[PDB]
Write a protein that binds this DNA or RNA. Structure first.
Ligand SMILES: Nc1nc2c(ncn2[C@H]2C[C@H](O)[C@@H](COP(=O)(O)OP(=O)(O)OP(=O)(O)O)O2)c(=O)[nH]1
Ligand SMILES: [Ca+2]
Length: 621
DNA sequence: TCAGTCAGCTAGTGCTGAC
DNA sequence: GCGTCAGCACTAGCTGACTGA
């Protein structure tokens, strides 16, 4: 059929006879001298539909003038699949205001003159890029030898302006329906992208989704201004890239130690399960069942010193019912089983072939409070213990520099509440976490070890964020045999909140007024459906900690290009960088300066510090 | 063949890991 | 009522298919 073969030469299949094929354009010449396919069926929307196609034999040099002397532009990238490591970019879209969208067919392109102009347009810092869900596209671009410096992703602006009311969607169609008075009609049910040949309607949608971003940017730049939400948007937009680089690299694991520890812990687990079942009075029990094990404990007459019966096996509550043989074995088995199933029996299933490294997937804003989250193998969940963390190593002749913010929260709260005592203490360079570990224990500061500091962390942050005295005493008597009276905990809670008056003022003033709008130091807003004192207290401080970490990522990413270094992980408040063995001192100094000058921006009165340790293995702090 | 007696999904829980 | 999130494993219940009626 000649009808379906209308526009084959441009690598287009005329599936639908709903198209038509050149017009004079008054472009600007390099000396500042003045010098597209369409669909037959029009759309009621005012969004752009026209577009060009740039092919190997369908290139003209003067196309580059369209991007020349520009300010903002839309960009979208459609890919064959979702695995960046084993997928190739299919299409690039560029949408200039009052211009048709421009398409580079990457499969149907073999020369490099076509691409250099787009390269230069991406490079320039002064050109702001509009990309929906920028993380995906930036991942692909950095993988395929592209370098971006500026982004303005409309998902970020939408979610920040949405004030975290509904957690779902925020796709292009939902946002376009919400803010703009347009309906994109995303009826494309993921058509065949692997095939090089593409139908016309699919490309019309591909150009439409890119073109709709420009009006969205125009309107959101006004909407963000009246809300005073520009700072957080800028920080997030500039921090999109370092997440992508960190996820592109990943962290290496030595398979020999992984397999050795797997076999050893498997043998330990089997002997432990044997001992556990033998200690229990029935052999058919499936141990992992919380309800079956609850019934088993009940029929074994396991009881507390008090008149209570086993209602749950939660570790926090389980730690009280000790001094029975079976429960020590139960807890040891639970620990080993968690370590095995969560990590060791699943980590080998995640080590990518031909790379021998793990790769994760960071969630930019899925968290309520703005922290990162990992949906793929969670590198934020790998255990603390050294013997399990050593398996992570740098590449050959490389060494890690591990920097962690020293007491990042309780520095945020100090500014947000502008308390004098906390800020003076942190000028004096004293450790609040160590002091917490010492006051509720022996008074010897030098005797406080890592575990005691770790327990101090939870109690201190909880009492800052609204924990009442009954639950605090439950926690304290659980994790350390204090056996403290209720009056002792009441006195401690009051002493803390009075010796730091600003925090008590903050609690009183946020409780007295049932405000439903809360802001972070980056003006990141939220609206709660119903008041909850704990979340209300939490959100500003944690949001500011997230903002400080994101700005630190931005500054460190900018500064690290000198030494060819690369970032591999960020978890929640620390950064790991792999740098060559010759530039260790430069890497350490750069990392400390970057973290310092990121923290000193939002916090203008407390001097943040960092614990930096040059490590051969990520486990070996 | 309808009516009464049976495997797969499927959201709900409990638990633990990090910060 | 201290917060954010992700992961592993059960097991009621709904819905669906087989043995009489
Ligand atoms: N509400 C609550 N927030 C926590 C808890 N643990 C950590 N956070 C937050 C606050 C921490 O400052 C932040 C970083 O965790 P870290 O383990 O690094 O604590 P920190 O940096 O203060 O100790 P460090 O100086 O690095 O040894 O995560 C917790 O148990 N409860
Ligand atoms: Ca830290």
């Amino acid at each position: 059929d000649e009808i379906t073969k209308k526009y084959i030469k441009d690598n287009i299949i005329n599936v639908d006879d709903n198209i038509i094929k050149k017009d004079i354009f008054k472009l600007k010449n390099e000396n500042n001298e003045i010098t597209y396919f369409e669909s037959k069926k029009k759309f009621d929307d005012d969004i752009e539909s026209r577009f060009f196609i740039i092919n190997d034999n369908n290139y003209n040099e003067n196309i580059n003038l369209i991007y020349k002397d520009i300010k903002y532009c839309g960009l979208n990238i459609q890919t064959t699949g979702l695995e960046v490591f084993d997928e190739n970019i299919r299409l690039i879209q560029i949408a200039v205001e009052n211009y048709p969208v421009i398409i580079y067919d990457m499969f149907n392109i073999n020369k490099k003159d076509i691409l250099d102009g787009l390269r230069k347009v991406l490079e320039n810092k002064n050109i702001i890029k509009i990309i929906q869900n920028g993380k995906f596209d930036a991942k692909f671009l950095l993988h395929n030898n592209f370098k971006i410096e500026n982004i303005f992703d409309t998902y970020i602006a939408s979610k920040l302006l949405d004030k975290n009311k509904n957690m779902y969607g925020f796709k292009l169609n939902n946002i376009v329906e919400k803010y703009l008075n347009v309906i994109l009609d995303k009826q494309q049910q993921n058509s065949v992208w692997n095939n090089s040949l593409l139908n016309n309607n699919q490309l019309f949608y591909a150009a439409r989704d890119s073109s709709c971003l420009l009006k969205l940017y125009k309107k959101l730049k006004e909407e963000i201004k009246k809300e005073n939400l520009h700072i957080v948007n800028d920080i997030e937009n500039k921090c999109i890239l370092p997440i992508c680089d960190m996820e592109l690299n990943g962290i290496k694991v030595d398979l020999e130690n992984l397999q050795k520890s797997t076999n050893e812990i498997l043998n330990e687990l089997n002997i432990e399960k044997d001992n556990l079942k033998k200690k229990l009075k029935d052999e058919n029990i499936n141990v992992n069942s919380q309800q079956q094990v609850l019934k088993a404990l009940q029929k074994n007459n396991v009881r507390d010193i008090s008149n209570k019966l086993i209602e749950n096996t939660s570790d926090s509550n389980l730690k009280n019912f000790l001094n029975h043989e079976e429960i020590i074995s139960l807890r040891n088995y639970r620990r080993l089983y968690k370590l095995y199933s969560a990590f060791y029996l699943k980590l080998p299933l995640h080590i990518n072939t031909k790379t021998n490294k793990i790769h994760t997937t960071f969630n930019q804003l899925k968290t309520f409070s703005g922290r990162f989250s990992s949906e793929k193998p969670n590198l934020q969940q790998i255990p603390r213990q050294k013997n399990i963390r050593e398996i992570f190593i740098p590449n050959d002749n490389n060494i890690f520099i591990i920097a962690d913010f020293k007491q990042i929260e309780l520095k945020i709260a100090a500014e947000i509440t502008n308390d004098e005592i906390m800020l003076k203490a942190y000028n004096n360079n004293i450790d609040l976490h160590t002091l917490t570990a010492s006051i509720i224990t022996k008074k010897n500061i030098p005797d406080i070890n890592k575990e005691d500091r770790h327990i101090a962390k939870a109690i201190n942050f909880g009492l800052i964020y609204g924990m009442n005295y009954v639950n605090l005493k439950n926690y304290a008597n659980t994790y350390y045999g204090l056996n403290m009276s209720l009056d002792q905990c009441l006195y401690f809670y009051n002493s803390f909140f009075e010796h730091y008056k600003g925090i008590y003022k903050w609690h009183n003033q946020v409780k007295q007024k049932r405000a439903l709008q809360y802001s972070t130091l980056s003006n990141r807003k939220v609206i709660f459906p119903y008041f909850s004192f704990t979340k209300a207290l939490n959100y500003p401080v944690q949001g500011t900690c997230a903002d400080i970490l994101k700005l630190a990522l931005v500054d460190l990413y900018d500064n690290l290009k000198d030494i060819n270094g690369k970032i591999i992980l960020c978890v929640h408040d620390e950064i790991i960088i792999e740098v060559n063995k010759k530039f260790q001192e430069e890497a350490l100094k750069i990392l400390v300066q970057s973290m310092e000058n990121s923290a000193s921006y939002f916090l203008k009165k407390v001097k943040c510090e960092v614990s930096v340790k040059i490590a051969e293995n990520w486990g070996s702090k």
